[PDB]
Amino acid sequence: GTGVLTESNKKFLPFQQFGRDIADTTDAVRDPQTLEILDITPCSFGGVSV
Amino acid sequence: EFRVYSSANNCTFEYVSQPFLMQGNFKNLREFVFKNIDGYFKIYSKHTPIIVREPEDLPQGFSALEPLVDLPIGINITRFQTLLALHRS
Numbered sequence: 312g313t314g315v316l317t318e319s320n321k322k323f324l325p326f327q328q329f330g331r332d333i334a335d336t337t338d339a340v341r342d343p344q345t346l347e348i349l350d351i352t353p354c355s356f357g358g359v360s361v
Numbered sequence: 362e363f364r365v366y367s368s369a370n371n372c373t374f375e376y377v378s379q380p381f382l383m384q385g386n387f388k389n390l391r392e393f394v395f396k397n398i399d400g401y402f403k404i405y406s407k408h409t410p411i412i413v414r415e416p417e418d419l420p421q422g423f424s425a426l427e428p429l430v431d432l433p434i435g436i437n438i439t440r441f442q443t444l445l446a447l448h449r450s
């Protein structure tokens with residue numbers, strides 16, 4: 312997908328790898344190489360009125 | 362030392378952990394759940410120190426169980442027993 316990846320403070324459990332939401336949308340993900348918990352959030356979007 | 366067996370045969374993969382699943386009257390609580398679904402034999406576990414009670418029953422509390430090992434072994438597991446170790450004085 313597409314989204315800004317920053318260092319999140321979500322206390323992920325060792326056996327856990329992903330993090331979903333109400334709509335089953337992945338919000339956080341664990342880096343496979345290094346033990347780090349990121350977060351998937353879109354950069355910017357919105358409507359355009361003329 | 363081992364006393365529950367004397368021999369073996371051909372079998373599947375074996376997994377091994379380096380630590381253990383283990384005034385002094387404060388009791389413990391070692392909960393386990395052995396579930397067999399879609400072939401994978403899942404095992405859950407959680408430890409918590411409990412206060413020593415008089416009837417020695419299940420404490421009035423709530424504690425979640427976390428997975429610790431998964432084994433894709435098992436064909437017909439509709440039976441089981443338990444094993445204990447007595448201290449020979």
Ligand SMILES: *[C@@H]1O[C@H](CO)[C@@H](O)[C@H](O)[C@H]1NC(C)=O
Nearest residue numbers: 341342343344345346347348
């Ligand atoms: C990833 O693999 C490379 C291969 O040489 C190794 O140098 C590096 O330390 C590894 N990193 C992790 C986090 O396992």
Ligand SMILES: *[C@@H]1O[C@H](CO)[C@@H](O)[C@H](O)[C@H]1NC(C)=O
Nearest residue numbers: 368369370371372373374436
């Ligand atoms: C050894 O392999 C055979 C293969 O047919 C299997 O049937 C058996 O369950 C295995 N384990 C034994 C004999 O302990």
Ligand SMILES: *[C@@H]1O[C@H](CO)[C@@H](O)[C@H](O)[C@H]1NC(C)=O
Nearest residue numbers: 400435436437438439440441
């Ligand atoms: C498992 O064992 C039970 C009783 O021994 C039997 O009724 C059942 O068919 C067996 N299932 C398989 C898959 O062997």
